[PDB]
Symmetry: D2
């Protein structure tokens, strides 16, 4: 029904990582062979799905856990460069159907900034997509978070290039996995652990002043915001009426509602619920919500049959389906972009 | 306006723990002197609040982190016994206004079962309230979860006594605190960390078959369900359409919506949002929602002015305000119970 | 997937009225030949639809405008008796699958009470369904409303038998049609005029004290309550804060929300909207909402595919789909009634 | 809290009509002496209210029933001209705080079009506000509707000037009053009759092709859309799936959702319900919703304390409170317009 939709939590993997791809698919797919074919394909199967379901344009990104799983910084940086080079070449086949997010090693802020700059300047990438914290340390058991002053040089690069950063989840690993998840392993991923990671990281950016030092920074969360809109009232209450009387205001200058109006976006990836969408329109606003799919972990059919048929006023179907993203990513014409 | 309300996430502390109380207050209270007085008081300040705001009956419970902070099992068990004996004596002063939940050391399933039984049979306590996992190990860095077969003896005691179990949060400690929370410490507690703990534990009970082995067991979550209602669609989708095709169905026989209809309850503690309440009525149903306050971390005025004045149909205001709890806790007569 | 659902705004017509049936189908059906077959059939097509869509029990009623279109009181009364005798015979073919509402001439309160009593006592009918006001006067241009003291004997009969009254719509006629609807005739029926009639009549019962004189009276409206839940706040405000300080309190002793908690029910007939259902759960409460179809003006497929697949908590799906009506109509077991 | 709000369903009356003002107040006010002073006051009481409640700009309109109550066309036209001349002079006192809608005699399309043009071109009025149908005929028992081709010249003037038309309610009179309302007179006005008139007229414009012949025409409804959003699903279903197979497609070329996205606006006048606002945000979209009060039938305190404190994302509070109206009415700066 609606044509020219934009999706932007849409993953690919390098052909040479088939064994890693099959392992991940053994956790999160019920048809691993199709999953492998679909996550590797760019220009045939993905285009067929999009043509069947009114998706004009997709911004592609590297699969989780991706480069954030790599704790050797030399190996991680080389892989990020190789991935960005590769997808830049694949999207040349269909530039009116595909863009790309930068894939980054996040071991070092300046290095990440320089690779993001190369991606935007050399290839016209639309932003960065990063799978939560960067694994680091001896067995990759440490975690690099980006909500501190060391990362100001990276966030300033984001706003100077004026591109958003998509904070995608990754799986729990090492000590955190063994202590919290190994004994309830079915909760790993979309059921719970993914949202716990992303919400921690983004609310860390909030409470550590990232959006105060970088008020134009745009951060995107999938899965209708990784629980955060559910607690909008409760977070705001415990910030404004409690923690900001105790020290939080020193590093957090606006309300959580301000940051959702000015800095934070949510997408519909993997959360095809009109009831939850309506609640998010109340708590976050339709201007800040973007359609997305989470392919190939989710199907085009599921996401698009939901969104195309959901009961929704026409103004917001148009905005969430494509017009919000057209403005955010400064998109020129693409297939059915005005249909 | 509505009288005879029942609240059941209402904390007290022992006078002799003032030093620990003042530390906890330094994290979660903006008026430490009033907090110390209010968390210790049972029969004067608490009654005055309840009289001003139409609260007929309160089921009291021990503050967090409580006994779950105590990793020496002998010390933890002695403190639980002391607390239960203490509160039983305190609530005899005003039995038409107060009941109590059992406070438990959860180091050993049979020990916890025996102390719950003593509380119910000797004192007429209404169930148990436990602050998430039990700290254990030589310096308290281990965590005891209850979503496994060792705890069958305990859960069968809950269903044999036919009393509910309230899974309350507690703070992150030790390794988990240092790795995830120390660099974003303003998120500890109500903003984020509390719900991450309780939702993990309760969904662990779901996916490890606790409610299949104990289909009559009632589990209560505060704070409108610790994010879980937001992801009801997404959890159900990733169970029924994904993980249940990969092995989860072998230890998880019903849908997440079944378990919320049959086993799980949520309360309004610390989440005084009509918009979110309405969304929870859609996702879990008004029959499964209980009024509560979270005093003295929240005020009677905030909780009761909100709920008394919220826009709500008369049927559900009556159920959520008192009639759901009257049925669940078999409370037929107390102050203003028929007002 | 839900089985054993109950539908209760489900119409039939006498075979001898083929022309009036075809005229009415010319306004409200896109397939007149199927409509004629379906509205006259009781025991084959209707059962086939129900078996395919998990409907265990249907309470049948006479099509609109039905007896309310007949302004000759002798002819009106004879037709009502004919219809009730007819449908009582028809449902004995499949008594486990069907009940019936009484069809009444509403020219005279005593006469209507006596025929309602005959239907319930002799045939075990479940209540009455009436298509808004009774046409009367020499050319049928008068309207008999039931919201006055003349009808106390009729409303007392409903409460004595403890059976509900379904206020179904009918078309505008005569002077009202000419002045308001003739020049915008596409609005006649479901788009607007139907709800305008029913809401006027039921809110007249409210404001003329019918539910004060008969506080056990149960009144059912289809189509999610004929606009009334949308204005629950506005009606309550203009009653309690305005009209009840100017004279309304003399004949209206409770609030509009009280009457929806105690007296008024709404059904999902012809309004297969989860968004509007959720709003109705907020403003009226799931305890007061009944599944229904509006067959054969709506299809089993539309109503049942919607309800079976709607995002809804399991508690309220069970209540709205059957358990509310099972209690309201004191039903014995029927096909799949506890499936 | 929010400053610079815009309200635009705000009524005044001429001092020389105090008798008629007091009669109207006897129906819809509980404090007649205050009502009389407030409905005639422009620059003192009205300004003090707005200063205390963060209202920067108000578009004023003549009270109901106003000129639509006058069935003598010479008398009606003279009064419209007098009222427009009067209010243009009155708003000169505080031009940064007030604008005005044109008041019109709607007996004749060209005459009304010419007076609207005079008001816009000579006085800078912002549009027209008309109280539903125009009384006409020998005793005023006829009604002039505007949903027909005779009114094309008027609607073309609206779009040529690019100003909106506010369809305000009026009381039922004459035969309609006697047949439908006299026996349930407490439903007259806000409880029911008002919405029945406006929804009929605007959905008449929809189904008689007014918005097809004049696709730039902007129509405003108060009271969150006079029931129409509640039935958006049902109207759309009975248009697209029923009536448009029987002839409606010949005079109605878009869906009802298209007309709410392109032509129709709703305001919050007299409907201070966050639950209903949230539902209207789903069904109509926050871009199409305007704050308003309905003063002095509603109080600034009721409307503004509600809206200032309602739980709502910051994006939509800004748009609904002022930014939607700033763009629709092409406003220059006014008090607190960018605060
Ligand atoms: Mg993804
Ligand atoms: Mg608590
Ligand atoms: Mg019907
Ligand atoms: Mg008004």
């Amino acid at each position: 029904h609606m044509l020219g939709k934009i999706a932007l939590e849409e993953a690919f993997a390098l052909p040479r990582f088939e064994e890693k791809t099959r392992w991940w698919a053994s956790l999160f797919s019920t048809d691993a062979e199709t999953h492998v074919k679909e996550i590797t394909d760019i220009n045939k199967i993905r285009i067929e799905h999009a043509d069947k379901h009114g998706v004009g344009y997709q911004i592609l990104s590297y699969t989780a856990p991706g480069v954030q799983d790599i704790w050797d910084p030399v190996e991680a940086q080389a892989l990020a460069v190789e991935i960005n080079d590769y997808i830049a070449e694949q999207v040349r086949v269909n530039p009116d159907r595909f863009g790309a997010f930068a894939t980054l090693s996040m071991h070092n802020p300046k290095e990440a900034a320089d690779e993001l700059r190369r991606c935007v300047e050399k290839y016209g990438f639309k932003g960065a997509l990063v799978n939560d914290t960067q694994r680091a340390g001896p067995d990759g058991d440490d975690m690099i978070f980006y909500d501190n002053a060391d990362w100001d040089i990276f966030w300033q690069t984001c706003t100077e290039l004026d591109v958003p950063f998509y904070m995608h989840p990754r799986n729990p690993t090492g000590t955190i996995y063994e202590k919290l998840w190994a004994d309830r392993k079915w909760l790993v991923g979309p059921p719970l652990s993914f949202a716990h990671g992303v919400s921690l990281h983004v609310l860390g950016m909030v409470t550590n002043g990232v959006f105060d030092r970088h008020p134009k920074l745009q951060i995107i969360m999938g899965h209708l915001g990784e629980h955060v809109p559910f607690d909008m009232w409760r977070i705001n209450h415990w910030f404004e009426d409690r923690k900001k009387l105790l020290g939080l205001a020193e590093t957090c200058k606006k309300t959580i509602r301000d940051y959702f109006a000015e800095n934070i976006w949510i997408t519909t990836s993997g959360h095809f619920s009109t009831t939850t969408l309506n609640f998010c329109m109340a708590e976050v606003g339709s201007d800040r919500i973007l359609f997305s799919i989470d392919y190939p972990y989710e199907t085009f059919s599921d996401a698009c049959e939901w969104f195309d048929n959901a009961e929704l006023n026409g103004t917001d179907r148009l905005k969430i389906g494509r017009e919000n993203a057209k403005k955010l990513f400064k998109l020129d014409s693409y297939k059915d972009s005005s249909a």
